[PDB]
Design an enzyme around this catalytic site. Structure first.
Site, PDB file in Angstrom:
ATOM      1  N   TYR B  19       0.823  -1.221   0.000  1.00 41.48           N
ATOM      2  CA  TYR B  19       0.000   0.000   0.000  1.00 41.48           C
ATOM      3  C   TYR B  19       0.855   1.268   0.000  1.00 41.48           C
ATOM      4  O   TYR B  19       0.593   2.219   0.747  1.00 41.48           O
ATOM      5  CB  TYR B  19      -0.983  -0.020   1.179  1.00 41.48           C
ATOM      6  CG  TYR B  19      -2.050  -1.060   0.998  1.00 41.48           C
ATOM      7  CD1 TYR B  19      -3.297  -0.710   0.494  1.00 41.48           C
ATOM      8  CD2 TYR B  19      -1.802  -2.399   1.291  1.00 41.48           C
ATOM      9  CE1 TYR B  19      -4.279  -1.663   0.308  1.00 41.48           C
ATOM     10  CE2 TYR B  19      -2.777  -3.362   1.103  1.00 41.48           C
ATOM     11  CZ  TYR B  19      -4.009  -2.983   0.608  1.00 41.48           C
ATOM     12  OH  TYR B  19      -4.988  -3.925   0.421  1.00 41.48           O
ATOM     13  N   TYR B 151     -11.658  -7.648   6.824  1.00 41.00           N
ATOM     14  CA  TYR B 151     -10.572  -7.680   5.854  1.00 41.00           C
ATOM     15  C   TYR B 151     -10.282  -9.129   5.507  1.00 41.00           C
ATOM     16  O   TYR B 151     -10.118  -9.961   6.406  1.00 41.00           O
ATOM     17  CB  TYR B 151      -9.299  -7.015   6.398  1.00 41.00           C
ATOM     18  CG  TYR B 151      -8.184  -7.046   5.371  1.00 41.00           C
ATOM     19  CD1 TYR B 151      -8.240  -6.230   4.239  1.00 41.00           C
ATOM     20  CD2 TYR B 151      -7.103  -7.926   5.500  1.00 41.00           C
ATOM     21  CE1 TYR B 151      -7.240  -6.263   3.278  1.00 41.00           C
ATOM     22  CE2 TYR B 151      -6.097  -7.959   4.540  1.00 41.00           C
ATOM     23  CZ  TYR B 151      -6.177  -7.130   3.435  1.00 41.00           C
ATOM     24  OH  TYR B 151      -5.190  -7.150   2.475  1.00 41.00           O
ATOM     25  N   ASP B 248     -12.996 -16.937   8.285  1.00 40.79           N
ATOM     26  CA  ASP B 248     -11.641 -16.598   7.908  1.00 40.79           C
ATOM     27  C   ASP B 248     -10.793 -16.482   9.177  1.00 40.79           C
ATOM     28  O   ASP B 248     -10.856 -15.475   9.883  1.00 40.79           O
ATOM     29  CB  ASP B 248     -11.651 -15.300   7.096  1.00 40.79           C
ATOM     30  CG  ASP B 248     -10.265 -14.856   6.687  1.00 40.79           C
ATOM     31  OD1 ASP B 248      -9.271 -15.411   7.194  1.00 40.79           O
ATOM     32  OD2 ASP B 248     -10.176 -13.928   5.867  1.00 40.79           O
ATOM     33  N   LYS B 277      -0.967 -17.332   7.684  1.00 39.95           N
ATOM     34  CA  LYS B 277      -0.100 -16.555   8.592  1.00 39.95           C
ATOM     35  C   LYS B 277       0.699 -17.431   9.567  1.00 39.95           C
ATOM     36  O   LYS B 277       1.772 -17.938   9.210  1.00 39.95           O
ATOM     37  CB  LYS B 277      -0.900 -15.466   9.321  1.00 39.95           C
ATOM     38  CG  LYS B 277      -1.327 -14.290   8.458  1.00 39.95           C
ATOM     39  CD  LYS B 277      -2.168 -13.311   9.269  1.00 39.95           C
ATOM     40  CE  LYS B 277      -2.511 -12.051   8.500  1.00 39.95           C
ATOM     41  NZ  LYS B 277      -1.343 -11.143   8.370  1.00 39.95           N
TER      42      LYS B 277
HETATM   43  C1  2B6 Z   1      -8.033 -12.334   8.055  1.00 35.31           C
HETATM   44  C2  2B6 Z   1      -7.257 -12.230   6.888  1.00 35.31           C
HETATM   45  N1  2B6 Z   1      -7.625 -12.901   5.781  1.00 35.31           N
HETATM   46  C3  2B6 Z   1      -6.865 -12.814   4.610  1.00 35.31           C
HETATM   47  C4  2B6 Z   1      -5.723 -12.026   4.542  1.00 35.31           C
HETATM   48  C5  2B6 Z   1      -5.019 -11.980   3.324  1.00 35.31           C
HETATM   49  O1  2B6 Z   1      -3.853 -12.793   3.444  1.00 35.31           O
HETATM   50  P1  2B6 Z   1      -2.570 -12.575   2.480  1.00 35.31           P
HETATM   51  O2  2B6 Z   1      -2.064 -11.074   2.693  1.00 35.31           O
HETATM   52  O3  2B6 Z   1      -1.551 -13.613   2.792  1.00 35.31           O
HETATM   53  O4  2B6 Z   1      -3.054 -12.638   0.990  1.00 35.31           O
HETATM   54  C6  2B6 Z   1      -5.281 -11.352   5.693  1.00 35.31           C
HETATM   55  C7  2B6 Z   1      -4.205 -10.469   5.577  1.00 35.31           C
HETATM   56  N2  2B6 Z   1      -3.781  -9.727   6.612  1.00 35.31           N
HETATM   57  N3  2B6 Z   1      -2.999  -8.757   6.335  1.00 35.31           N
HETATM   58  C8  2B6 Z   1      -2.390  -8.117   7.360  1.00 35.31           C
HETATM   59  O5  2B6 Z   1      -2.671  -8.333   8.540  1.00 35.31           O
HETATM   60  C9  2B6 Z   1      -1.742  -7.001   7.027  1.00 35.31           C
HETATM   61  N4  2B6 Z   1      -1.364  -6.585   5.810  1.00 35.31           N
HETATM   62  C10 2B6 Z   1      -0.820  -5.341   5.781  1.00 35.31           C
HETATM   63  C11 2B6 Z   1      -0.319  -4.686   4.724  1.00 35.31           C
HETATM   64  C12 2B6 Z   1       0.209  -3.396   4.835  1.00 35.31           C
HETATM   65  C13 2B6 Z   1       0.215  -2.774   6.078  1.00 35.31           C
HETATM   66  C14 2B6 Z   1      -0.321  -3.481   7.154  1.00 35.31           C
HETATM   67  C15 2B6 Z   1      -0.811  -4.721   6.991  1.00 35.31           C
HETATM   68  S1  2B6 Z   1      -1.481  -5.757   8.101  1.00 35.31           S
HETATM   69  C16 2B6 Z   1      -6.110 -11.433   6.841  1.00 35.31           C
HETATM   70  O6  2B6 Z   1      -5.778 -10.769   7.994  1.00 35.31           O
END
Ligand code: 2B6
Ligand code: 2B6
Ligand code: CL
Lengths: 428, 428
Positions: B19, B151, B248, B277
């Site tokens: 981002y 999210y 999720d 994760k």
């Molecule tokens: C509940 C949940 N489901 C799916 C995803 C997406 O997983 P992925 O990023 O491995 O494609 C996530 C992805 N989570 N992302 C993060 O916690 C963060 N991504 C960013 C990116 C930029 C800045 C801060 C964050 S926190 C998720 O929390």
């Protein structure tokens, strides 16, 4: 777990690519080791050594367990497994970005890392959409491609897969409706490019990008086309102000006889995807590259940023092994190696042309294809190939190989021999 | 090889971050040169300093970085088999991991589809749900429903179920699928909210494939907690109106909220579940989508006959191997007591923040600590203050938060919380 125990667990609990649960025509074969160009598989309770003729789906370019790649991984593992890429950077990411920006077609100056090919395609589309929004032209939001293509299995990626014949055909109704030109022919025909331009011309105001696999269309049919078509695409896209995206996830890193397939035409796309062989097939990693102009326009837009950022973005481990894989490729005479491979495939597959069930034999770099006159039955093909010391995975009507670059001439001939015998069984 | 200054130069010119912009970044990223246990080594004014990984590198580093057991699992597998294709082959790491995941997840989740990221796992979940209803002869059931604040990743389908504000849907006018959104789920249990959710679902029931939510904790969309009883209500609503339930648990999984999976707080099983994760202990990108026997069989018995998905690196042996080790390490200790102690540590350390002028809420759920402020937290002020205190923190919007490695000692938890309290103090 024993091989029997593995099979039992697998049948009960494991989904396989594009498969059913409980309705598989064949059980999968248990793999217990991989070293160099060879896999150790379990057959009738006994381990057998077979050639990885598919390079584990076009990933294992240096073979398995290459000492340089193994040690690149363990070296990075000692230092740093992973850190978040938000607010932090690292040496493996920087080393890999530097390498990629230098070796890809001219003008590709920025690198967005992701964790798979499909995602890198979604990133490419997002770059194109945000680019035009940054130019105050949000109407430019559709994609155009030609038939016979494949770009992955996520929903946007699916929308540019071949519609009538591609694996995602049953999904049309919920996919984004994209623009499709007819199948690009093998031989150069100016009429095709003229028709492509005429069709693009009428959608130009609603098109963000043309997206294609350059020179070789992989999962959609192992079809090859004249590189001159890419020159035409570049020109058309330039004149009608539509971005050009090359998906080099399968074609990258020397596979078609040039470092990138785009190089066969001397063409630079605005956006490019790489994956698969990027890591030498150790770990999942992909990248989407774009020009400075695309990057700056996105960055100056209302968003002020590219709105994408996977959790494991630029994973140090995956980046470190990729650095080693790319350096290993660049540090040898890879062009001669691929030329020798291609010659080996051509010589070895020649006899297949005369077989009753064979409709075409074609080779492009380290890619060999026997096209048959009927769908290939895996229940026949798999054991036949294993009987001849080779792991082959036909699909549709195609018996094909994309062997590791480290395969010796003798190993290539073993692979082509097994391919010919599979093709013989198809017609008998 | 590159020095930290060289890394910054390459990074500024060539590297996208999550981002982020190219050439318009307010602050340069900080060079990370090592990670061990709960600590990162970062370069601050040319000097390497050790700081606590308060975020666990976005939920991932549950056992800390470079845990000897996890390092050894990876290196052990590396000497045996880095990777093979999952089309037609299976292997021990995939079988071992699938067995573990089936055993430890909420009752009824019998099948496992491996993929290479969280977003992909969510797309696979949606594909399972849509194909399920096609297999039931109800292809009109193709929309998704969720509540606000969520999210689920960055791919275009995953984006469609993200919070419309958090996910900047205003930038994506008529590109995203239009899904059904219920209002933000409250913290405290109110039967009226569930009754209203049910009434909204009821009128869309005939066009809904699934409800998708993050259970108990909404992560990237605002670090919000809700009463587990809401999940009990969702299970009931979905049952009665014949809509699938998808949880999720990509962020909530593997003990983070004080239960092994957040669904366990409610004593509910979804029809489909996503994990990622912490799955690999933060070593590598891997994710999984689990579903019930009913879902798997209904897909498989449909006219389609197969789930049309299959990533190149599906069920990668290395990722699976380190995940097996990570899961076994969690299960082999008293993880419940560990998380309880962490929760207590976070509660005690953050208690002083409640009285601060700019603080609107302080909340803890298992090994998750959050200070919500009445205004956006200034990163240029927040970073040096935390770095002085030996802590890497990454505030976003009005939130100062941590999800520390499970291996953090009471002293380290005190260090983390003190830094958070100071960041909040400087906001006011
Ligand atoms: C509940 C949940 N489901 C799916 C995803 C997406 O997983 P992925 O990023 O491995 O494609 C996530 C992805 N989570 N992302 C993060 O916690 C963060 N991504 C960013 C990116 C930029 C800045 C801060 C964050 S926190 C998720 O929390
Ligand atoms: C040009 C191109 N672009 C994107 C992708 C998707 O990458 P990914 O699988 O990492 O998400 C790919 C994926 N390639 N897929 C494969 O080579 C195959 N997977 C299967 C599965 C079953 C049967 C045949 C194949 S070929 C690609 O070739
Ligand atoms: Cl397959």
């Amino acid at each position: 777990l024993t091989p029997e125990q593995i099979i039992a667990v697998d049948g009960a609990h494991l989904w396989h690519p594009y498969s059913s649960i409980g309705r598989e025509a064949v059980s999968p074969v248990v793999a217990v080791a991989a070293h160099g160009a060879w896999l150790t598989l379990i057959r009738d309770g006994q381990p057998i050594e077979v050639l990885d003729a598919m390079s584990s789906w076009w990933t294992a370019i240096h073979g398995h367990g290459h000492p340089a790649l193994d040690q690149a991984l363990t070296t990075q593992l000692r230092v740093m497994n992973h850190v978040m890429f938000g607010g932090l950077t690292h040496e493996p990411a920087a080393r890999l970005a530097k390498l990629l920006v230098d070796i890809t077609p001219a003008g590709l100056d920025t690198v967005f890392f992701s964790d798979s090919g499909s995602v890198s395609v979604e990133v490419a589309a997002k770059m194109a959409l945000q680019y035009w929004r940054g130019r105050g032209l949000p109407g430019k939001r559709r994609l155009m491609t030609w038939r016979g293509g494949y770009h992955g299995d996520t929903f946007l990626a699916m929308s540019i897969c071949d519609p009538h014949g591609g694996m995602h055909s049953l999904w049309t109704d919920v996919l984004a409706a994209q623009v499709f030109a007819p199948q690009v022919p093998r031989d150069y025909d100016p009429a095709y490019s003229a028709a492509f331009e005429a069709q693009l011309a009428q959608h130009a105001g609603e098109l963000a990008a043309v997206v294609v696999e350059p020179v070789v269309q992989g999962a959609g049919g192992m079809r090859f086309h004249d590189p001159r078509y890419l020159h035409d695409l570049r020109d058309i896209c330039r004149r009608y102000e539509v971005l050009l995206i090359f998906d080099e996830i399968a074609t990258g890193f020397g596979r078609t006889g040039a470092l990138f397939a785009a190089d066969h035409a001397g063409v630079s796309p605005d956006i490019m995807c790489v994956g698969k062989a990027l890591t030498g097939g150790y770990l999942s990693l992909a990248a989407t590259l774009c020009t400075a102009d695309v990057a700056h326009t996105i960055s100056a837009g209302a968003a002020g940023a590219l709105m994408h950022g996977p959790t494991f973005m630029a994973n140090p481990l995956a980046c470190a092994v990729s650095v080693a894989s790319v350096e290993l490729l660049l540090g040898q005479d890879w062009r001669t190696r691929i030329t020798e491979l291609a010659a080996g495939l051509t010589a070895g597959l020649d006899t297949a042309r005369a077989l009753p069930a064979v409709t075409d034999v074609r080779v492009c770099g380290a890619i060999g294809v026997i096209e048959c006159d009927r769908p290939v039955d895996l229940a026949v093909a798999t054991p036949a190939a294993l009987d001849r010391g080779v792991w082959l995975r036909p699909f549709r009507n195609l018996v094909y190989a994309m062997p590791p670059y480290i395969c010796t001439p003798a190993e290539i001939t073993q692979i082509t021999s097994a391919m010919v015998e599979v093709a013989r069984l198809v017609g008998s």
